[PDB]
Amino acid sequence: KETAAAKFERQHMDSSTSAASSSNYCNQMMKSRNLTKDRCKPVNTFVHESLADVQAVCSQKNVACKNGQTNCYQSYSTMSITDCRETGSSKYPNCAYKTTQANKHIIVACEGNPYVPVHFDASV
Amino acid sequence: KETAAAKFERQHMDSSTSAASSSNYCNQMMKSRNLTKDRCKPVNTFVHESLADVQAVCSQKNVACKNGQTNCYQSYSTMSITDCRETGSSKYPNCAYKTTQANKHIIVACEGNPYVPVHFDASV
């Protein structure tokens, strides 16, 4: 079993690139980050900033999570991100994703000590 | 009781303005659209495009909804939107919102005949 923090890193962190490299970025990443194993995870966002910058969001703008929880934080700045979403031709175990690059604020839920991201809520 | 389509329009459509007009936009809109009545709705997005343009998204890019449903659609173009999110000083019945303006693709779930938006899933 993964810690909540490590699962966030696996699902959402890609500091190795400044932005999605091709239209196939999501197909490759959803697979290598183990998000197509038991099923096709329908929607998932990768952040192309350092881990330190993403962790720093937990000390930024406190905002409500979509579900009403009070431990969500919005980044003061925009960040390079990629939205991966299953498309019509996607059928487990043959998972297919649309790659959409963008620059926006991210909203994450934070927990623990050290207080670090444990869920990606949204981007704005 | 509202139809699903009318509830979408009430919660998410603002074609009267090209973008949020002030930092108080969300406080005003969340109230007048009746989203602070029984509780503070934690998160809500308004779209500043014509209703025809938003309805047209149901014939655009078919993508998975965050919950796995297959009836979600992503707009081919970006749209002017405003993200409203409760902030720390928010306590029902005194609801307080942060206003964040942006330009991005919207993702909506569509249902019915006419096939129209019934849920705002996300923006990218």
PDB file of C-alpha atoms in Angstrom:
ATOM      1  CA  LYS A   1       0.000   0.000   0.000  1.00  0.00           C
ATOM      2  CA  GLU A   2       1.155   3.520  -0.870  1.00  0.00           C
ATOM      3  CA  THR A   3       1.262   6.465   1.485  1.00  0.00           C
ATOM      4  CA  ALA A   4      -1.215   9.161   0.386  1.00  0.00           C
ATOM      5  CA  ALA A   5       1.726  11.484  -0.396  1.00  0.00           C
ATOM      6  CA  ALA A   6       3.546   8.923  -2.551  1.00  0.00           C
ATOM      7  CA  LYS A   7       0.387   8.101  -4.441  1.00  0.00           C
ATOM      8  CA  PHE A   8      -0.002  11.818  -5.236  1.00  0.00           C
ATOM      9  CA  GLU A   9       3.547  11.944  -6.563  1.00  0.00           C
ATOM     10  CA  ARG A  10       3.025   8.827  -8.714  1.00  0.00           C
ATOM     11  CA  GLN A  11      -0.292  10.020 -10.180  1.00  0.00           C
ATOM     12  CA  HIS A  12       0.402  13.721 -10.565  1.00  0.00           C
ATOM     13  CA  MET A  13       4.115  14.725 -10.641  1.00  0.00           C
ATOM     14  CA  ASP A  14       6.184  15.034 -13.830  1.00  0.00           C
ATOM     15  CA  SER A  15       9.068  17.441 -13.261  1.00  0.00           C
ATOM     16  CA  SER A  16      11.136  15.754 -15.972  1.00  0.00           C
ATOM     17  CA  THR A  17       9.500  17.826 -18.693  1.00  0.00           C
ATOM     18  CA  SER A  18       8.351  21.428 -19.034  1.00  0.00           C
ATOM     19  CA  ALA A  19       5.143  20.354 -20.828  1.00  0.00           C
ATOM     20  CA  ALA A  20       3.570  17.345 -22.549  1.00  0.00           C
ATOM     21  CA  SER A  21       5.965  16.265 -25.325  1.00  0.00           C
ATOM     22  CA  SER A  22       3.469  14.849 -27.865  1.00  0.00           C
ATOM     23  CA  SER A  23      -0.189  13.913 -28.355  1.00  0.00           C
ATOM     24  CA  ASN A  24       0.830  10.481 -27.076  1.00  0.00           C
ATOM     25  CA  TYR A  25       2.087  11.828 -23.743  1.00  0.00           C
ATOM     26  CA  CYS A  26      -0.995  10.736 -21.795  1.00  0.00           C
ATOM     27  CA  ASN A  27      -1.096   7.239 -23.309  1.00  0.00           C
ATOM     28  CA  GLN A  28       2.507   6.728 -22.275  1.00  0.00           C
ATOM     29  CA  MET A  29       2.248   8.316 -18.815  1.00  0.00           C
ATOM     30  CA  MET A  30      -1.053   6.796 -17.742  1.00  0.00           C
ATOM     31  CA  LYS A  31       0.524   3.414 -18.460  1.00  0.00           C
ATOM     32  CA  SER A  32       3.945   3.905 -16.916  1.00  0.00           C
ATOM     33  CA  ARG A  33       2.468   5.487 -13.758  1.00  0.00           C
ATOM     34  CA  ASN A  34       0.304   2.385 -13.352  1.00  0.00           C
ATOM     35  CA  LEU A  35      -3.032   4.072 -13.905  1.00  0.00           C
ATOM     36  CA  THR A  36      -4.278   1.564 -16.474  1.00  0.00           C
ATOM     37  CA  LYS A  37      -3.559  -1.634 -14.501  1.00  0.00           C
ATOM     38  CA  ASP A  38      -6.876  -2.640 -12.935  1.00  0.00           C
ATOM     39  CA  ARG A  39      -8.930  -0.226 -15.059  1.00  0.00           C
ATOM     40  CA  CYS A  40      -8.615   2.902 -17.179  1.00  0.00           C
ATOM     41  CA  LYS A  41      -8.423   5.763 -14.706  1.00  0.00           C
ATOM     42  CA  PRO A  42     -10.850   8.126 -16.487  1.00  0.00           C
ATOM     43  CA  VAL A  43      -9.251  11.509 -15.741  1.00  0.00           C
ATOM     44  CA  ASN A  44      -5.821  12.481 -14.409  1.00  0.00           C
ATOM     45  CA  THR A  45      -3.630  15.601 -14.348  1.00  0.00           C
ATOM     46  CA  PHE A  46       0.180  15.772 -14.383  1.00  0.00           C
ATOM     47  CA  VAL A  47       2.028  18.842 -13.079  1.00  0.00           C
ATOM     48  CA  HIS A  48       5.265  19.920 -14.782  1.00  0.00           C
ATOM     49  CA  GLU A  49       6.838  21.874 -11.965  1.00  0.00           C
ATOM     50  CA  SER A  50       9.353  20.862  -9.342  1.00  0.00           C
ATOM     51  CA  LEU A  51       8.118  18.765  -6.436  1.00  0.00           C
ATOM     52  CA  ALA A  52       9.164  21.590  -4.110  1.00  0.00           C
ATOM     53  CA  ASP A  53       6.889  24.035  -6.004  1.00  0.00           C
ATOM     54  CA  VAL A  54       3.910  21.679  -5.860  1.00  0.00           C
ATOM     55  CA  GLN A  55       4.475  20.880  -2.181  1.00  0.00           C
ATOM     56  CA  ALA A  56       4.664  24.635  -1.575  1.00  0.00           C
ATOM     57  CA  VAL A  57       1.022  24.957  -2.649  1.00  0.00           C
ATOM     58  CA  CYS A  58       0.004  23.565   0.762  1.00  0.00           C
ATOM     59  CA  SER A  59       1.123  26.899   2.243  1.00  0.00           C
ATOM     60  CA  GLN A  60      -0.669  29.015  -0.378  1.00  0.00           C
ATOM     61  CA  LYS A  61      -4.328  29.989  -0.846  1.00  0.00           C
ATOM     62  CA  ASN A  62      -6.645  28.010   1.434  1.00  0.00           C
ATOM     63  CA  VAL A  63      -9.844  27.188  -0.519  1.00  0.00           C
ATOM     64  CA  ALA A  64     -12.655  24.658  -0.288  1.00  0.00           C
ATOM     65  CA  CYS A  65     -12.310  21.316  -2.039  1.00  0.00           C
ATOM     66  CA  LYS A  66     -15.045  20.366  -4.496  1.00  0.00           C
ATOM     67  CA  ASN A  67     -16.499  18.031  -1.846  1.00  0.00           C
ATOM     68  CA  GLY A  68     -16.645  20.695   0.877  1.00  0.00           C
ATOM     69  CA  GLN A  69     -13.484  19.751   2.808  1.00  0.00           C
ATOM     70  CA  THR A  70     -11.457  22.697   4.105  1.00  0.00           C
ATOM     71  CA  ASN A  71      -7.924  21.401   3.454  1.00  0.00           C
ATOM     72  CA  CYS A  72      -7.564  22.431  -0.215  1.00  0.00           C
ATOM     73  CA  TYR A  73      -5.069  24.987  -1.493  1.00  0.00           C
ATOM     74  CA  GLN A  74      -4.855  26.935  -4.737  1.00  0.00           C
ATOM     75  CA  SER A  75      -1.488  27.867  -6.192  1.00  0.00           C
ATOM     76  CA  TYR A  76      -0.863  31.616  -6.248  1.00  0.00           C
ATOM     77  CA  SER A  77       0.770  31.256  -9.668  1.00  0.00           C
ATOM     78  CA  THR A  78      -0.128  29.241 -12.759  1.00  0.00           C
ATOM     79  CA  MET A  79       1.734  26.002 -13.419  1.00  0.00           C
ATOM     80  CA  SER A  80       2.461  23.920 -16.502  1.00  0.00           C
ATOM     81  CA  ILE A  81       0.061  20.969 -16.408  1.00  0.00           C
ATOM     82  CA  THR A  82      -1.320  18.215 -18.640  1.00  0.00           C
ATOM     83  CA  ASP A  83      -4.890  16.928 -18.449  1.00  0.00           C
ATOM     84  CA  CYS A  84      -5.274  13.272 -19.492  1.00  0.00           C
ATOM     85  CA  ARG A  85      -8.802  12.055 -20.218  1.00  0.00           C
ATOM     86  CA  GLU A  86     -10.120   8.835 -21.752  1.00  0.00           C
ATOM     87  CA  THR A  87     -11.534   9.248 -25.261  1.00  0.00           C
ATOM     88  CA  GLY A  88     -14.212   7.322 -27.156  1.00  0.00           C
ATOM     89  CA  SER A  89     -11.928   4.634 -28.555  1.00  0.00           C
ATOM     90  CA  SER A  90     -10.865   3.641 -25.039  1.00  0.00           C
ATOM     91  CA  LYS A  91     -11.729   0.180 -23.744  1.00  0.00           C
ATOM     92  CA  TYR A  92      -9.909  -1.556 -20.900  1.00  0.00           C
ATOM     93  CA  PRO A  93      -7.382  -3.088 -21.171  1.00  0.00           C
ATOM     94  CA  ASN A  94      -6.773  -0.945 -24.240  1.00  0.00           C
ATOM     95  CA  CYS A  95      -6.787   2.505 -22.626  1.00  0.00           C
ATOM     96  CA  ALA A  96      -6.683   5.594 -24.839  1.00  0.00           C
ATOM     97  CA  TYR A  97      -6.227   9.189 -23.656  1.00  0.00           C
ATOM     98  CA  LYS A  98      -6.513  12.708 -24.985  1.00  0.00           C
ATOM     99  CA  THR A  99      -3.592  14.945 -23.979  1.00  0.00           C
ATOM    100  CA  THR A 100      -4.403  18.582 -23.199  1.00  0.00           C
ATOM    101  CA  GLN A 101      -1.559  20.898 -22.184  1.00  0.00           C
ATOM    102  CA  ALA A 102      -2.265  24.061 -20.214  1.00  0.00           C
ATOM    103  CA  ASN A 103      -1.010  26.639 -17.747  1.00  0.00           C
ATOM    104  CA  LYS A 104      -3.175  27.152 -14.727  1.00  0.00           C
ATOM    105  CA  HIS A 105      -3.482  27.334 -10.976  1.00  0.00           C
ATOM    106  CA  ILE A 106      -3.694  23.966  -9.318  1.00  0.00           C
ATOM    107  CA  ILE A 107      -5.861  23.057  -6.357  1.00  0.00           C
ATOM    108  CA  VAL A 108      -4.722  20.241  -4.095  1.00  0.00           C
ATOM    109  CA  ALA A 109      -5.800  18.788  -0.753  1.00  0.00           C
ATOM    110  CA  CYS A 110      -3.046  18.562   1.835  1.00  0.00           C
ATOM    111  CA  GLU A 111      -2.578  16.322   4.877  1.00  0.00           C
ATOM    112  CA  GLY A 112       0.003  15.192   7.378  1.00  0.00           C
ATOM    113  CA  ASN A 113       3.269  16.335   8.893  1.00  0.00           C
ATOM    114  CA  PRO A 114       5.041  17.339   6.686  1.00  0.00           C
ATOM    115  CA  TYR A 115       1.856  18.912   5.290  1.00  0.00           C
ATOM    116  CA  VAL A 116       1.942  17.743   1.671  1.00  0.00           C
ATOM    117  CA  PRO A 117      -0.459  17.166  -1.264  1.00  0.00           C
ATOM    118  CA  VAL A 118      -2.543  13.962  -1.092  1.00  0.00           C
ATOM    119  CA  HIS A 119      -5.214  14.639  -3.764  1.00  0.00           C
ATOM    120  CA  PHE A 120      -5.455  16.667  -6.965  1.00  0.00           C
ATOM    121  CA  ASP A 121      -8.781  18.499  -6.830  1.00  0.00           C
ATOM    122  CA  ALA A 122      -8.769  20.674  -9.918  1.00  0.00           C
ATOM    123  CA  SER A 123      -7.007  23.336 -11.883  1.00  0.00           C
ATOM    124  CA  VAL A 124      -8.297  26.786 -12.700  1.00  0.00           C
TER     125      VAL A 124
ATOM    126  CA  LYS B   1     -37.982  20.842  -8.811  1.00  0.00           C
ATOM    127  CA  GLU B   2     -35.718  21.985 -11.648  1.00  0.00           C
ATOM    128  CA  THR B   3     -35.047  20.101 -14.847  1.00  0.00           C
ATOM    129  CA  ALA B   4     -31.385  19.021 -15.033  1.00  0.00           C
ATOM    130  CA  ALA B   5     -30.879  21.400 -17.989  1.00  0.00           C
ATOM    131  CA  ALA B   6     -32.369  24.410 -16.191  1.00  0.00           C
ATOM    132  CA  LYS B   7     -30.316  23.724 -13.102  1.00  0.00           C
ATOM    133  CA  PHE B   8     -27.180  23.754 -15.286  1.00  0.00           C
ATOM    134  CA  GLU B   9     -28.172  27.115 -16.732  1.00  0.00           C
ATOM    135  CA  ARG B  10     -28.860  28.582 -13.269  1.00  0.00           C
ATOM    136  CA  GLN B  11     -25.593  27.321 -11.749  1.00  0.00           C
ATOM    137  CA  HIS B  12     -23.235  27.783 -14.674  1.00  0.00           C
ATOM    138  CA  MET B  13     -24.388  30.269 -17.373  1.00  0.00           C
ATOM    139  CA  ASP B  14     -23.510  33.980 -17.380  1.00  0.00           C
ATOM    140  CA  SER B  15     -23.643  35.325 -20.931  1.00  0.00           C
ATOM    141  CA  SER B  16     -24.370  38.841 -19.675  1.00  0.00           C
ATOM    142  CA  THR B  17     -20.682  39.568 -19.179  1.00  0.00           C
ATOM    143  CA  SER B  18     -17.485  38.759 -21.060  1.00  0.00           C
ATOM    144  CA  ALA B  19     -15.629  37.990 -17.800  1.00  0.00           C
ATOM    145  CA  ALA B  20     -15.944  38.424 -14.031  1.00  0.00           C
ATOM    146  CA  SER B  21     -16.391  42.161 -13.368  1.00  0.00           C
ATOM    147  CA  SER B  22     -14.724  42.446  -9.929  1.00  0.00           C
ATOM    148  CA  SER B  23     -13.247  40.407  -7.073  1.00  0.00           C
ATOM    149  CA  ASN B  24     -16.768  40.427  -5.639  1.00  0.00           C
ATOM    150  CA  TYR B  25     -18.282  38.728  -8.692  1.00  0.00           C
ATOM    151  CA  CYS B  26     -18.513  35.303  -7.049  1.00  0.00           C
ATOM    152  CA  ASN B  27     -20.012  36.618  -3.800  1.00  0.00           C
ATOM    153  CA  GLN B  28     -22.730  38.335  -5.794  1.00  0.00           C
ATOM    154  CA  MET B  29     -23.386  35.499  -8.262  1.00  0.00           C
ATOM    155  CA  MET B  30     -23.324  32.602  -5.822  1.00  0.00           C
ATOM    156  CA  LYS B  31     -26.019  34.458  -3.891  1.00  0.00           C
ATOM    157  CA  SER B  32     -28.243  35.600  -6.733  1.00  0.00           C
ATOM    158  CA  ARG B  33     -28.125  32.164  -8.417  1.00  0.00           C
ATOM    159  CA  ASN B  34     -29.349  30.646  -5.151  1.00  0.00           C
ATOM    160  CA  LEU B  35     -26.228  28.665  -4.364  1.00  0.00           C
ATOM    161  CA  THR B  36     -25.915  29.902  -0.784  1.00  0.00           C
ATOM    162  CA  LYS B  37     -29.499  29.192   0.351  1.00  0.00           C
ATOM    163  CA  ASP B  38     -29.347  25.881   2.216  1.00  0.00           C
ATOM    164  CA  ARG B  39     -25.538  25.861   2.437  1.00  0.00           C
ATOM    165  CA  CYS B  40     -22.444  27.383   0.860  1.00  0.00           C
ATOM    166  CA  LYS B  41     -21.936  25.477  -2.371  1.00  0.00           C
ATOM    167  CA  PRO B  42     -18.157  24.956  -2.057  1.00  0.00           C
ATOM    168  CA  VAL B  43     -17.079  25.226  -5.706  1.00  0.00           C
ATOM    169  CA  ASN B  44     -18.868  26.491  -8.817  1.00  0.00           C
ATOM    170  CA  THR B  45     -17.897  27.683 -12.307  1.00  0.00           C
ATOM    171  CA  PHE B  46     -19.685  30.270 -14.465  1.00  0.00           C
ATOM    172  CA  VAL B  47     -19.243  30.324 -18.251  1.00  0.00           C
ATOM    173  CA  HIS B  48     -19.232  33.675 -20.070  1.00  0.00           C
ATOM    174  CA  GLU B  49     -20.219  32.522 -23.523  1.00  0.00           C
ATOM    175  CA  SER B  50     -23.581  32.378 -25.227  1.00  0.00           C
ATOM    176  CA  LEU B  51     -25.937  29.577 -24.240  1.00  0.00           C
ATOM    177  CA  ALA B  52     -25.805  28.359 -27.842  1.00  0.00           C
ATOM    178  CA  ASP B  53     -21.987  28.018 -27.621  1.00  0.00           C
ATOM    179  CA  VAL B  54     -22.154  26.084 -24.354  1.00  0.00           C
ATOM    180  CA  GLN B  55     -24.956  23.831 -25.608  1.00  0.00           C
ATOM    181  CA  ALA B  56     -22.839  23.222 -28.714  1.00  0.00           C
ATOM    182  CA  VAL B  57     -20.207  21.522 -26.545  1.00  0.00           C
ATOM    183  CA  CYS B  58     -22.467  18.442 -26.401  1.00  0.00           C
ATOM    184  CA  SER B  59     -21.575  17.853 -30.064  1.00  0.00           C
ATOM    185  CA  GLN B  60     -17.832  18.397 -29.558  1.00  0.00           C
ATOM    186  CA  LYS B  61     -15.076  16.191 -28.110  1.00  0.00           C
ATOM    187  CA  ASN B  62     -16.470  13.109 -26.366  1.00  0.00           C
ATOM    188  CA  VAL B  63     -14.362  12.443 -23.230  1.00  0.00           C
ATOM    189  CA  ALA B  64     -14.778  10.571 -19.962  1.00  0.00           C
ATOM    190  CA  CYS B  65     -16.270  12.349 -16.968  1.00  0.00           C
ATOM    191  CA  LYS B  66     -14.212  12.376 -13.776  1.00  0.00           C
ATOM    192  CA  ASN B  67     -16.480   9.634 -12.390  1.00  0.00           C
ATOM    193  CA  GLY B  68     -16.069   7.331 -15.400  1.00  0.00           C
ATOM    194  CA  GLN B  69     -19.340   8.126 -17.213  1.00  0.00           C
ATOM    195  CA  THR B  70     -19.069   8.315 -21.002  1.00  0.00           C
ATOM    196  CA  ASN B  71     -21.377  11.281 -21.679  1.00  0.00           C
ATOM    197  CA  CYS B  72     -18.891  14.132 -21.096  1.00  0.00           C
ATOM    198  CA  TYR B  73     -17.735  16.556 -23.776  1.00  0.00           C
ATOM    199  CA  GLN B  74     -14.783  18.925 -23.965  1.00  0.00           C
ATOM    200  CA  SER B  75     -15.071  22.195 -25.850  1.00  0.00           C
ATOM    201  CA  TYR B  76     -12.822  22.364 -28.911  1.00  0.00           C
ATOM    202  CA  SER B  77     -12.051  26.003 -28.096  1.00  0.00           C
ATOM    203  CA  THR B  78     -11.299  27.819 -24.848  1.00  0.00           C
ATOM    204  CA  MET B  79     -14.073  29.815 -23.199  1.00  0.00           C
ATOM    205  CA  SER B  80     -14.191  32.728 -20.777  1.00  0.00           C
ATOM    206  CA  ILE B  81     -15.024  31.268 -17.364  1.00  0.00           C
ATOM    207  CA  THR B  82     -14.990  32.186 -13.673  1.00  0.00           C
ATOM    208  CA  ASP B  83     -14.161  29.734 -10.890  1.00  0.00           C
ATOM    209  CA  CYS B  84     -15.878  30.524  -7.569  1.00  0.00           C
ATOM    210  CA  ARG B  85     -14.531  28.768  -4.479  1.00  0.00           C
ATOM    211  CA  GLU B  86     -15.217  29.253  -0.771  1.00  0.00           C
ATOM    212  CA  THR B  87     -12.339  30.837   1.151  1.00  0.00           C
ATOM    213  CA  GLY B  88     -11.272  30.566   4.792  1.00  0.00           C
ATOM    214  CA  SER B  89     -13.489  33.345   6.119  1.00  0.00           C
ATOM    215  CA  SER B  90     -16.586  31.565   4.808  1.00  0.00           C
ATOM    216  CA  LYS B  91     -19.185  30.302   7.268  1.00  0.00           C
ATOM    217  CA  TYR B  92     -22.805  29.584   6.375  1.00  0.00           C
ATOM    218  CA  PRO B  93     -24.968  31.610   6.253  1.00  0.00           C
ATOM    219  CA  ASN B  94     -22.178  34.104   5.636  1.00  0.00           C
ATOM    220  CA  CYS B  95     -20.707  32.641   2.442  1.00  0.00           C
ATOM    221  CA  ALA B  96     -17.483  34.092   1.045  1.00  0.00           C
ATOM    222  CA  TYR B  97     -15.919  33.252  -2.327  1.00  0.00           C
ATOM    223  CA  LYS B  98     -12.682  33.757  -4.199  1.00  0.00           C
ATOM    224  CA  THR B  99     -13.185  34.819  -7.827  1.00  0.00           C
ATOM    225  CA  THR B 100     -10.737  33.415 -10.383  1.00  0.00           C
ATOM    226  CA  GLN B 101     -11.151  34.412 -14.031  1.00  0.00           C
ATOM    227  CA  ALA B 102      -9.717  32.243 -16.792  1.00  0.00           C
ATOM    228  CA  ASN B 103      -9.933  31.082 -20.385  1.00  0.00           C
ATOM    229  CA  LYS B 104     -10.116  27.365 -20.859  1.00  0.00           C
ATOM    230  CA  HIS B 105     -11.854  24.395 -22.392  1.00  0.00           C
ATOM    231  CA  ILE B 106     -14.914  23.299 -20.502  1.00  0.00           C
ATOM    232  CA  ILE B 107     -16.026  19.737 -19.907  1.00  0.00           C
ATOM    233  CA  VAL B 108     -19.720  19.069 -19.399  1.00  0.00           C
ATOM    234  CA  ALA B 109     -21.953  16.004 -19.149  1.00  0.00           C
ATOM    235  CA  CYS B 110     -24.886  15.987 -21.543  1.00  0.00           C
ATOM    236  CA  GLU B 111     -28.271  14.249 -21.423  1.00  0.00           C
ATOM    237  CA  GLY B 112     -31.681  14.248 -23.025  1.00  0.00           C
ATOM    238  CA  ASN B 113     -33.369  15.256 -26.250  1.00  0.00           C
ATOM    239  CA  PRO B 114     -32.399  17.993 -27.017  1.00  0.00           C
ATOM    240  CA  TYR B 115     -28.979  16.739 -25.875  1.00  0.00           C
ATOM    241  CA  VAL B 116     -27.868  19.542 -23.556  1.00  0.00           C
ATOM    242  CA  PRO B 117     -25.470  20.115 -20.617  1.00  0.00           C
ATOM    243  CA  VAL B 118     -26.677  18.832 -17.221  1.00  0.00           C
ATOM    244  CA  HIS B 119     -23.435  18.931 -15.167  1.00  0.00           C
ATOM    245  CA  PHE B 120     -20.223  20.956 -15.188  1.00  0.00           C
ATOM    246  CA  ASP B 121     -17.379  18.466 -14.799  1.00  0.00           C
ATOM    247  CA  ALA B 122     -14.257  20.567 -15.111  1.00  0.00           C
ATOM    248  CA  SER B 123     -12.290  22.990 -17.189  1.00  0.00           C
ATOM    249  CA  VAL B 124      -8.869  22.447 -18.684  1.00  0.00           C
TER     250      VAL B 124
END
